[PDB]
């Protein structure tokens, strides 16, 4: 399943990586790419943003509609084992690079001394261009269930194995 243009339009440069608009008001990213010592995100003051973060997953809920062009989509805490997700990687040039990954177990993992609630996966070589393999932290892990796309994690770590941070 190819991610449609509106789905890619949710992937947004943020901090030292990327994040993803789940809805007009909800933005998700990986905690370690979030800038510190700032007074605003996307021009909105801290006092107008509800933060929900843990385990390398960060969610922002803005008090104002920031992306009213978007429908609200489902964010899930990971996905069933064996799901094939696409990691929606974008280059600075705007080139789109969906990377297929076979997902494994949701688990608690220590990664470089930080507690990560995440899901491991293995890149699906057979579903990516030859040689297309491992600043992309925060890219969303998505999959299509029935008629709807679901987001289930944000890119956090890699070595042919990857980990997305997850949160409900």
Swiss-Prot record:
It comes from the Viruses. Residues 3-168 form the Peptidase C37 domain. Transmembrane segments: none annotated. The active site is at 32 (for 3clpro activity), 56 (for 3clpro activity), 137 (for 3clpro activity). Inhibited by the chemical compound K36/GC376, which covalently binds to the nucleophilic cysteine residue. Inhibited by various macrocyclic inhibitors. It catalyses: Endopeptidase with a preference for cleavage when the P1 position is occupied by Glu-|-Xaa and the P1' position is occupied by Gly-|-Yaa. Changing residue 56 to G: Complete loss of 3CLpro activity. Changing residue 56 to A: Complete loss of 3CLpro activity. Homodimer. Monomer; in solution. Processes the polyprotein. 3CLpro-RdRp is first released by autocleavage, then all other proteins are cleaved. May cleave host polyadenylate-binding protein thereby inhibiting cellular translation. This is 3C-like protease.
């Amino acid at each position: 399943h190819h991610a449609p243009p509106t789905l890619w339009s949710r992937v947004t440069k943020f901090g030292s990586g990327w994040g993803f608009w789940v809805s007009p008001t909800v933005f998700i990213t990986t905690t370690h790419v979030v800038p510190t010592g700032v007074k605003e995100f996307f021009g909105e003051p801290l006092s107008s943003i509800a933060i929900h973060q843990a385990g390398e997953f960060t969610q922002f809920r803005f008090s104002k509609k920031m992306r009213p062009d978007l429908t609200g989509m489902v964010l899930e805490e990971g996905c069933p084992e064996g799901t094939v997700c696409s990691v929606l990687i974008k280059r600075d040039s705007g080139e789109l690079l969906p990377l297929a990954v076979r997902m494994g177990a949701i688990a608690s993992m220590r990664i470089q001394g930080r507690l990560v609630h995440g899901q491991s996966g293995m890149l699906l070589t057979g579903a990516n261009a030859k040689g297309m393999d491992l600043g992309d932290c925060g890219a969303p892990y998505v999959h299509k269930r029935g008629n709807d796309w679901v987001v289930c994690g944000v890119h956090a770590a890699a070595t042919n194995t990857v980990v997305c941070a997850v949160q409900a």
